């Protein structure tokens, strides 16, 4: 179990760690988060009390280094940093653990939610979507735009998700216009899976990461990406059986975790109604269709 210590909490802030969150008061003696489960990526995220504008945060994996959070009064945010001196960190952390100045990552033993939300998410792929190669962790916030959004303006600060566009030469073979537009299997299976992602695990990983950025930061381009990746599978007549079964599980846990009050903005009516009721895969997502109908019957 690993630890992300904090030098201090000089400004009042709601701190999230994965799907958990807690309020820290201005200059409260808070010095970090302990008992973080090893083996998963994690996200530690922030919303200031004074400016609910800009949720922001950091994706990280404690196996890749020792990370600590420090408030920067110039840039006005909590920054993740890496401590190379493994003894400065062991001692700095032990001091804070002995003084009980840390919150415990509050996982219930039965609870597989975080695993189920991040099953295919890997730090190395996060770091290719979020390009900042001098750091081992990745900053995301509510305002960052996606590469595809930029095409339709700072490239250093973009989300480089895989561009998916159903009315594009990449998606449509000359001579198969109608066939490929109405059945996207060649785009899914040959262009994206075999060609770009290489396997379905990497596809699902980007889909899951896009959802998490939409949920935790209200990042609109990430929501667009999540829905596009769902719609590309549902609009394919030919999808490997294992992928459909895994997609059903993935979406179930995303829909289960979504705040009930954010459904209006984070869920695209057209995509979900098409995927669950019109598409080729309308009968392949039993778990997802059941939770959607019992939790958000209005949207449908």
């Amino acid at each position: 179990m690993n630890t992300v210590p904090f030098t201090s909490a000089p400004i009042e802030v709601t701190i999230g760690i994965d799907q958990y969150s807690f309020n820290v008061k201005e200059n409260q003696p808070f010095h970090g988060i302990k008992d973080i489960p090893i083996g998963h990526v994690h996200v530690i995220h922030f919303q200031h009390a004074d400016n609910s504008s800009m949720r922001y945060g950091y994706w990280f994996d404690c196996r890749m280094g020792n990370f600590y959070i420090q408030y920067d009064p110039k840039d006005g945010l909590y920054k993740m940093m890496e401590e190379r001196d493994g003894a400065k960190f062991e001692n700095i952390v032990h001091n804070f653990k002995e003084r009980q100045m840390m919150v415990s990552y509050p996982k219930i033993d039965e609870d597989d939610t975080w695993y189920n939300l991040t099953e295919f998410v890997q730090m190395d792929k996060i770091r290719k979507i979020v390009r900042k190669d001098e750091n081992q962790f990745s900053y995301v916030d509510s305002s960052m735009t996606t590469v595809q959004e930029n095409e339709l303006s700072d490239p250093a600060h973009s989300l480089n998700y895989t561009v998916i566009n159903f009315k594009s030469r990449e998606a449509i073979r000359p001579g198969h216009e109608m066939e490929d537009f109405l059945d996207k299997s060649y785009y899914l299976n040959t262009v994206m899976l075999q060609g770009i992602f290489k396997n379905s695990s990497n596809y699902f990983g980007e889909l899951q990461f896009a959802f998490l950025n939409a949920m935790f930061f209200g990042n609109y381009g990430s929501s667009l990406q999540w829905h596009a990746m769902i719609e590309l599978i549902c609009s394919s007549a030919t999808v490997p059986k294992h992928m459909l079964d895994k997609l059903d599980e993935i979406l179930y846990y995303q829909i289960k975790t979504l705040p009930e009050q954010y459904s209006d903005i984070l869920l695209n009516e057209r995509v979900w109604n098409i995927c669950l009721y019109s598409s080729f895969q309308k009968n392949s997502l039993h778990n997802t269709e059941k939770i959607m109908e019992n939790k958000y019957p209005e949207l449908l």
Binding site: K167, S168, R169, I172, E177, M178, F181
Partner: protein, 237 residues
Amino acid sequence: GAMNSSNYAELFNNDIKLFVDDTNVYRVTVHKTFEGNVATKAINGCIFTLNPKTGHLFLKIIHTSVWAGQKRLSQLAKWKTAEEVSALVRSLPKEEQPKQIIVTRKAMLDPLEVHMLDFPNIAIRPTELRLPFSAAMSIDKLSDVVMKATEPQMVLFNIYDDWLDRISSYTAFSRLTLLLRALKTNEESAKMILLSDPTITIKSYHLWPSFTDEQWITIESQMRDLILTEYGRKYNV
């Protein structure tokens, strides 16, 4: 974006554009079977592709053989239309290719956009106008060439005959749409008006009768009377 009453003169500027109407592409007669069920029998159709500035009509005849062994024909008809329009554009010299294509039905937008991906600079636009191009098969010479076709065929016409020698393209289009609206609302009465006089003749190379300017005023008046009436006969007013 969409074409409506407010940007109407754009049709007669010097940017090449085509209207595409797909109404008459997939045409059927519905009939009873010996077992008393219902079946359709397709008949030849056409794509109506029209330059509104010049009158040039590219009439792609759709022979019933194109539907043999195909499913969901009303959906296929939209993609067949887009394939043929795309093939037409590719066949034209660059300087004759349209800068915009206006579809009369919004369901043609995605089929045509996908077929024209090679032409990112050609704008595909819907319209808010209720244009009467479906009545094109009420023009006897167009109907004749569609029904006689035994294979796919493109036939080129000028739907304005020689009118542009005497009137503007705005006025020619207004006359065309008036004639077609009449033919659509009451084909028999409209046709009586036009060619009920046997001493008035259509030229071999023309589609409509050779009216003098004064006879066109009378004719156009008789069509507007027909349309208003039917609009009464229809709503009782």
